[PDB]
C-alpha cells in the first residue's frame, strides 16, 4: 500500500 | 518489476 | 484462537 | 517480481 | 504430523 | 504422529 | 537505453 | 522533469 | 551454482 | 535492455 | 464429569 | 486418548 | 486405556 | 515384551 | 532414514 | 560482437 498519489513517470 | 507487497507464503 | 490474517506456509 | 530460474525487470 | 490449529499428533 | 521427512515449504 | 525521457531498462 | 527543448541526438 | 536439490522457502 | 552493438549517431 | 460446555478447539 | 470416565473394575 | 502392550491412544 | 500366559482385570 | 527391521509395537 | 553460442538464459 504505497498510497498517496505517486506520479511514477 | 515493482513493489510486489503481496503476502505470499 | 488463531488470528485469521495468518499466512501459514 | 517473483521469478523462476531467471527473473529480470 | 503437523496441523493448522492443533494436531493431536 | 511420526513425522517422517518433511522436505516442505 | 534511449527512449528519451524515461527508460525503464 | 526533463526540459523539452534540447535536441536529442 | 545452485545446482542441487533445494527448497526455496 | 542489452543495448546492442547498434553503433549510431 | 465434564459439566460445562467444553471446547476442545 | 482421553480415558474419559473409568467407572469400572 | 489398557491396550494390551500397544495402547497408543 | 510380555509374552507369557497372563491374567488381567 | 528409518533403517532396517524395525518393530513398531 | 556477441555471437558466442551464448545462453542468456
For chain G positions 1-9, those within 8 Å of chain H (CB to CB) are: 4-5
- CA-based radius of gyration for chain G: 5
d(CA G6, CA G8): 6
Q: For Cα atoms F1, F5, C2, give the angle at the middle one, nearest 5 degrees.
A: 55
**The C-alpha cell of D5 is what?**
530460474
Query: Cβ separation of B8 and D1 shorter than 8 Å?
Result: no
DSSP annotation string for A1-9: ---S-----
* Chain E contact set for F3 (CB, 8 A): 1-2, 9
**List of long-range contacts for A2-6, beta carbons under 8 Å, 24+ apart:** A2/B3, A2/B5
Q: Give the residue from chain F lying closest to I6, CA to CA.
A: F7
Amino acid at each position: 500500500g504505497f498510497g498517496g498519489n505517486d506520479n511514477f513517470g
